[model samples]
Target chain A: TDNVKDITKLVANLPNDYMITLNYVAGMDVLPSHCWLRDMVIQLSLSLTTLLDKFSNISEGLSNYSIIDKLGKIVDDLVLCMEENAPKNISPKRPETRSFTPEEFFSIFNRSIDAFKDFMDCVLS
Target chain B: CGNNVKDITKLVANLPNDYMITLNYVAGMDVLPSHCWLRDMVIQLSLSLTTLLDKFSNISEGLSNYSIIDKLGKIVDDLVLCMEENAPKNISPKRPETRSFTPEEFFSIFNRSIDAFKDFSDCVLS
Candidate 1:
């Protein structure tokens, strides 16, 4: 539970320039810069929503309702914050979508989440 | 309509249930691979449906769009290319309308086979 809390705290505190820095990491100047913090928040919102929908039935099948519920509420708060802070924006600065199997994406997200999880560990160490 | 449906019902029934499709071809195991006809058939059928769906104007449908099907077809086409890349030859020829299936009949069978494929892959991958 604390591991999830640290992840939530890290996401909640991310700087607006996070995507710009990560854009260089993702592909050095190959993609357009997402210089706004709001862009990353919106994307994080979208991805969480997509993964939650994918796992909707898994809770029933595997008896994992608590963590999915825990994660689901945090997603709700992120979306709520976006809506409350938004008038919204223009220009097609869309993040590119990549293909992976349903099985593959879970592992991919685990790696990305662990990157954040590690940073939280770094601050403590 | 019932007679037409019954014909396909009878035709699909002719497919063997136990070895309905062995995925040895998909896995590229030993060459006990004679039953790969269904894989070729599903790939083409999905491509054609994607084309058929793409014909609709966005205004013509309230919710469905060609963009969705076009992307799906792209994946199917890419999978074909991957198989060709692996084998270094084109997929073998398949007969047209071998089961004398209607458009809907073929789609129903296509969906059924994918369900089998889905369950099998899920179990094997994990």
Candidate 2:
């Protein structure tokens, strides 16, 4: 909880899909530095989805399924914050952790407890 | 003069220096550290892949004064454009202080991450 927020805010930074097609696209002259922040979101999104899906409901592996659901929202806002930063310009910057509330940001991540911290370090990386 | 190739190449070449400096190799068997694994993947992949494509441009464009690795550059850009239409998105890469990747390292991890990807996919598909 406090830790996830700490990581997200401290890092000041840092993906994907079903069977999940993952790829990166840019324009002819566009700089990668510009797209980088968002590329990260996809990577993290993909990671979380993998973890969340790892334990299935009706499946006994998870003691609580909602935690996965909650973690998704942390990533969800992680994405949102970037869009507001707009990701491409580079000048505007991310503008603090304002894009999400601590509840939306940390609580969502806190939901996963240990798993939350693990995948997150993956993202911050 | 979008010729920041100098800046780009400088970072590309310098990456190895940082990478070596930051390495915390443990059991000496040549296995990459887990710390380096997920931590560096995206940054490593993004730079190396683009670096890979740009050379394709440089070589293909040749030394003629026609002024366009532009075509190959665009192709690399489209590699990202493959972006415009694709998936959801994370944030910052390594700082000046952090370790970066060489093309070889990028390939190495791409191979490892592909395996990581499959584990995720199998869980999804199975």
Candidate 3:
């Protein structure tokens, strides 16, 4: 509803939040840094799938439910495991504030995709 | 995490100091103040595990060059014991600085974290 540009900028930083918060604090500077690889993929995957959900719905006039179906399937597979067996336990909480606009969210999503590619490129190079 | 017997014995020589310093840093960074007794105990328990593995490694590996694989395995076991023996106390998600946790609870949580770290080490072992 607000200015699209402002939202886009905000969204750009969201992926950074998802990946770096724990690494900065708890993660050791160790060989492989394997968790980063997992996090990079998870964030990138989530971001892209969200875009596919929104983009196809808008451009091709496909039902949003179509993407939601895929998302639901993924959540069932990945998240349900955490919910059922996390030793520390986990919970679902509705965000209190709308921090990112759709534009911002999508921008972060794209950035995460780019970041993932860049990271992999580093390994390959 | 993982360590061969030779490395565990070598590592045991330095374990007390390494553990004390490591605990100091980890506990110091926590928003909640660390209890002096709990911190001391964790370091002690971690050291004991290291020493135990060192003895086992000495029994198996003699003076010759030891395998990294064996060292790493002992390290994993030692760390697992450290964690299971002393997990942290009950943590308060709401309080950035926790005070309600008793010594037992602190030991439990801390040990669990070590167990988790040992798992991470296992991934790197092979």
Candidate 4:
């Protein structure tokens, strides 16, 4: 429930840019040791994308309050916060050895860059 | 045009009251004439529930034997197909059919089943 609450609050503040970031982070989750959890998260990511598309289509009246779009943004924010706060919250910490691989670090960094670019595009629009 | 109704005159067919009482006691609830249809319907519902449970159990066993991801993907796809196929049966007829089942109640059962199956698959995968 605590995690759920934190996730909900984070998603509430999400801008469009973070969706791309989430997609990248999810890609990393699909690799090697984390493969088992991939399908569930992928399903969620797909649902969010589909819902966001629907919300874009039905940009009108009372139906404008789309559940999918709202949920997607929430998911995006939660991932972002989780990654940012990983040093404190994520385990099991080892000082001598790095937790994330070079490839993973690059993937995450690239993802943030893509998100920033998307945010700029939104701003320009 | 010339047909006339005949009141079959007699004290009806001869059946001993003592024998009838014995039969009634033996038959029990089945002898309750007013509830005949209700009893039959309950039997039908029981059969349907049995079938549904059997299919679910089979799916569970299949998942256990095979790869969880493979089995679950198949089930989810099949469920989606089944839901689409049964859409008309789900909605009521525009013209009055013999019965009028409430729309909410009808689909809620299906929705609940879908949710349950989904959770079952998710738990296995997790």
Query: Which residue runs does candidate 4 get wrong by more than 4 Å?
Result: A1-43, A48-74, A79-125, B1-37, B50-126
Evaluated against the true structure, the overall lDDT of model 4 is 0.29
Candidate 2 segments whose C-alpha is farther than 4 A from its true place: A1-35, A58-64, A89-125, B1-126
Q: By lDDT, highest first, what's the ranking?
A: 1, 2, 3, 4
- List TM-scores of chain B, every candidate: 0.41, 0.31, 0.23, 0.21
lDDT of 1 by residue, A34-108 (tens): 223334444545655543332223222111223434555654554465457654552443455654432333343
Q: lDDT tens string, model 3, B1-126? A: 232133323232222111221122233322333332233434444543343333322322222112332444455456546554665564122212223332233334445544445453111111
Encode model 4's per-residue lDDT on A5-119: one tens digit a residue: 2222222222111222223323333333222122323334554464354222223221212434554565566456444643332321112222232233334433433343333
Docking class of 2: incorrect
After superposition, candidate 3 runs with Cα above 4 Å error: A1-60, A67-98, A121-125, B1-126
**lDDT per residue, candidate 4, B4-100, as tens digits?**
1011010011111111110001122223332222222223223333332222112221111112223333443455454445433323112211222
**What ordering of candidates by TM-score runs from best to worst?**
1, 2, 4, 3
Docking class of 3: incorrect
Over the true interface, candidate 3 deviates by an RMSD, in Å, of 26.3
The lDDT of each candidate is 0.36, 0.34, 0.33, 0.29
Candidate with best TM-score: 1
Could you give me the TM-score of model 3 versus the true structure?
A: 0.19
Among all windows of 10 consecutive residues in model 4 chain B, the one with the lowest summed lDDT is: B1-10
TM-score of chain A of 4: 0.29
Q: Who wins the lDDT comparison?
A: 1
